[PDB]
Design an enzyme around this catalytic site. Structure first.
Site, mmCIF file in Angstrom:
data_model
loop_
_atom_site.group_PDB
_atom_site.id
_atom_site.type_symbol
_atom_site.label_atom_id
_atom_site.label_comp_id
_atom_site.label_asym_id
_atom_site.label_seq_id
_atom_site.Cartn_x
_atom_site.Cartn_y
_atom_site.Cartn_z
ATOM 1 N N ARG A 117 0.885 -1.187 0.000
ATOM 2 C CA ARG A 117 0.000 0.000 0.000
ATOM 3 C C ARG A 117 0.927 1.244 0.000
ATOM 4 O O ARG A 117 1.828 1.346 0.837
ATOM 5 C CB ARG A 117 -0.774 0.033 1.337
ATOM 6 C CG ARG A 117 -2.257 0.255 1.271
ATOM 7 C CD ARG A 117 -2.964 -0.824 0.449
ATOM 8 N NE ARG A 117 -3.914 -1.650 1.218
ATOM 9 C CZ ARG A 117 -5.220 -1.389 1.380
ATOM 10 N NH1 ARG A 117 -5.769 -0.304 0.835
ATOM 11 N NH2 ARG A 117 -5.985 -2.219 2.091
ATOM 12 N N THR A 121 -0.559 8.199 -0.213
ATOM 13 C CA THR A 121 -1.959 7.877 -0.300
ATOM 14 C C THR A 121 -1.942 6.588 0.493
ATOM 15 O O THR A 121 -1.690 6.583 1.700
ATOM 16 C CB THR A 121 -2.361 7.599 -1.769
ATOM 17 O OG1 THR A 121 -1.382 6.750 -2.402
ATOM 18 C CG2 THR A 121 -2.477 8.921 -2.524
ATOM 19 N N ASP A 215 -2.632 -9.326 13.990
ATOM 20 C CA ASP A 215 -1.885 -9.320 12.750
ATOM 21 C C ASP A 215 -1.525 -10.753 12.505
ATOM 22 O O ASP A 215 -0.679 -11.339 13.199
ATOM 23 C CB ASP A 215 -0.610 -8.476 12.870
ATOM 24 C CG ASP A 215 0.016 -8.192 11.516
ATOM 25 O OD1 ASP A 215 0.752 -9.066 10.992
ATOM 26 O OD2 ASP A 215 -0.353 -7.141 10.932
ATOM 27 N N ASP A 218 2.369 -11.562 11.305
ATOM 28 C CA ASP A 218 3.346 -11.438 12.363
ATOM 29 C C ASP A 218 3.190 -12.623 13.354
ATOM 30 O O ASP A 218 4.198 -13.173 13.843
ATOM 31 C CB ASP A 218 3.069 -10.210 13.215
ATOM 32 C CG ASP A 218 3.634 -8.943 12.648
ATOM 33 O OD1 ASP A 218 4.252 -8.958 11.589
ATOM 34 O OD2 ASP A 218 3.426 -7.899 13.289
#
Ligand SMILES: O=c1[nH]cc(F)c(=O)[nH]1
Ligand SMILES: O=c1[nH]cc(F)c(=O)[nH]1
Ligand SMILES: O=c1[nH]cc(F)c(=O)[nH]1
Ligand SMILES: O=c1[nH]cc(F)c(=O)[nH]1
Lengths: 224, 224, 224, 224
Positions: A117, A121, A215, A218
């Site tokens: 990502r 932005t 997560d 992880d």
């Protein structure tokens, strides 16, 4: 409320299959969901659940009827699966599903896609990829444990499409999804198929599903 | 045909639990029954099928309920399985399933019972057994892949009842059964649970299930 | 001539450990070195060898003596391992090894590093990385099946070192090396240990090892 | 002490094969020998060792030379193992080693032999056996974790000989042995091969090896 939420996804997107909510699946989800869960344990059940999820998704491949003869020399009518397929994982959380996929489909080809990502932005960007050559001719098991915004899976799909994969031959295999990621996924690619273990309620400002699992990547890789 | 049989069996015997007859299931069944399947393939697919069956079966144990809190610091309403169990394989064929139990339940205690029927008289005698000392206080997954006459699983249930195991705490795990096997078991021990993957039409003169699979133990271990 | 290369390498680099060349080890390498071997087979044997290889590398960890007592109530003099470790894989080829590390080290922490050579020039560049937080304190099992020029693997180390990992705590797990790479690794980082299964005589203009195995990563993932 | 020990036997019995006493092995032996190690672990580590033990024994089999051609379109002189084999487990403790064998040799035929010492006489007698029809045509991997007095394995051997297997074609795979055991097997069938992982000092007044591991089968299957 879960119920009401399960069914609505269900009556709503004919394209998703919800893995059967057995007492066992639920126990597994419990162990995984729990913060108190040590890594050794988490991996073990996560792996346990993944084999089940895959076995389920594999039912979306296509099959022909095959008839054989028993050692008793009588005829049995069955079926066979003839499609060329491959699994594509989204690095890195998706990588944890490869094993499961490989345990049941001996030597299945595996593509890997790295999406990041953007910082400014947060538009998701394709960073790296290694796909089988003739992937245009294959059915695709798109691998990704979590489906929050669907930002990434959508990007993954964009690229697969770009390479010639047919939308209708993509099976999105997942563990935990958000009503919202489900919606965006079918709004852009109604033809895909999505198989999931669970739908949670909402998404956080940090875009983590909830109650969720934390997560995943992880937790699984131990990069806590 | 099969649907009828299936229905009646399902109707007169509520402790039977036939697995989901998915297309993948059938397909596995397809390769396993084929007389031509090479030993390596037979084994590989049996184990696969086996894993799914054990997973089906574990859903028969009692489970608590458990609320846990996630890394998202919120709570999750889960479930936990709190009973004490063990696997009892019927030697030899039942041994093929042990691994699958062990794959999913690490370190699960394993009992073995070698029943053999007499050469002339044809009756099941108990020849060797080695079980956990407190099997009395446990839930037993009895493992034996084929069920034709139920002649031998019945003897295995009898000795377990003599050691003091509760009937309703025995879960009979099976791959393939004949309707007649079913009727028998439930006639002698109405309080057991049975989880099976397939129910064949009937048995031949030699009491072999048909269309069936042949000699499972022989095809699994390679002694034919 | 093999022996000749094996020994000259063995006397010059006290830090390399070569696996004992057994007929079985050579039988595995034969199968995987061969161009004619199918994906399903190549994957099987690569996994097979990898496991033997980690088992080997693991003996480079430090261990304490530990004394226990046997069920017979007599004491036995053991030798416990107790250091923190983690595997770090070089994407993509290296990732094929984590499964082996995990087969034997339950829930071992895994770190991933993606490095791409530079087009115009040729310097390997750090594309992406995801490691445990406290890696500076762990011993690291660095994994990469092949070692041609050693560029990539000298880069992964460089980043490790900068993150604070002590050089003599790095174990380089490799299947196949070229002397040349073995040479750059130690000239640059003399204090690290390398465990390998085979050393081939030469490297070609395209930087492939000969007679070598071809592109390991794609034959294993089947993106060839 | 121990060193004087491995020395005499290695000297007196040229067909014995002790595995490399590496730190890990010791480490492993340390956990399996301890009386406080829990079932889940004991099995995890026993399996781990057994797998190394089998890789070791596999080297005792005859092999052919094979030159292959690598993807670099060049030659490699490998070797290949061509014999017909099968494993034969001494029921019940020997059963724990099948899995190891099957993990490395997919689909190998497995024969079983259950031998018990008579309740009064102590004589060991064949109680049950199911073996490949052509075992005489094969190389036999005989597994039995423990070898004390050797009453059991000698009888096992005897029946394979009655069946026609060649004495020289039997590879006895063992985890722990006592000197007495080894001398007996050798006095009796000097032509067999024995690969073991450790040799203890002696037998207790009760015929247990010390320092030992205690009853393997019971700690392995959970019958303690
Ligand atoms: O790893 C994650 N990705 C996305 C999610 F929404 C979440 O909870 N976890
Ligand atoms: O292994 C088997 N036992 C009994 C049967 F009837 C059969 O079909 N198979
Ligand atoms: O996969 C590989 N990449 C590069 C090499 F030099 C080699 O031998 N193999
Ligand atoms: O389980 C065991 N069998 C035989 C032995 F001699 C021993 O010590 N332990």
């Amino acid at each position: 409320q879960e119920e009401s939420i399960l069914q609505d996804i269900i009556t709503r997107f004919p394209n998703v299959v919800l893995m059967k909510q057995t007492a066992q699946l639920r126990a597994m989800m419990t162990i995984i969901r729990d913060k108190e869960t040590p890594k050794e344990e988490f991996v073990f059940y996560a792996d346990r659940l993944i084999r089940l999820l895959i076995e389920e998704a594999l039912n979306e491949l296509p099959f022909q009827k095959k008839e054989v003869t028993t050692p008793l020399d009588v005829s049995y009518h069955g079926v066979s699966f003839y499609s060329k397929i491959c699994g594509v994982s989204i690095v890195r959380a998706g990588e944890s599903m490869e094993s499961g996929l490989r345990a049941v489909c001996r030597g299945v080809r595996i593509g890997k896609i790295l999406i990041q990502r953007d910082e400014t932005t947060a538009e998701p960007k394709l960073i790296y990829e290694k796909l089988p050559a003739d992937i245009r001719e294959r059915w695709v098991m798109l691998l990704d444990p979590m489906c929050a915004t669907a930002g990434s899976v959508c990007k993954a799909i964009e690229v697969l499409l770009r390479l010639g994969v047919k939308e209708e031959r993509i099976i999105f295999v997942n563990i935990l999804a958000a009503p919202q990621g489900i919606e965006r996924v079918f709004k852009e690619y109604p033809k895909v198929r999505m198989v999931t273990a669970a739908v949670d309620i909402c998404l956080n400002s940090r875009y983590y599903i909830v109650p969720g699992i934390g997560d995943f990547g992880d937790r699984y890789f131990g990069t806590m």
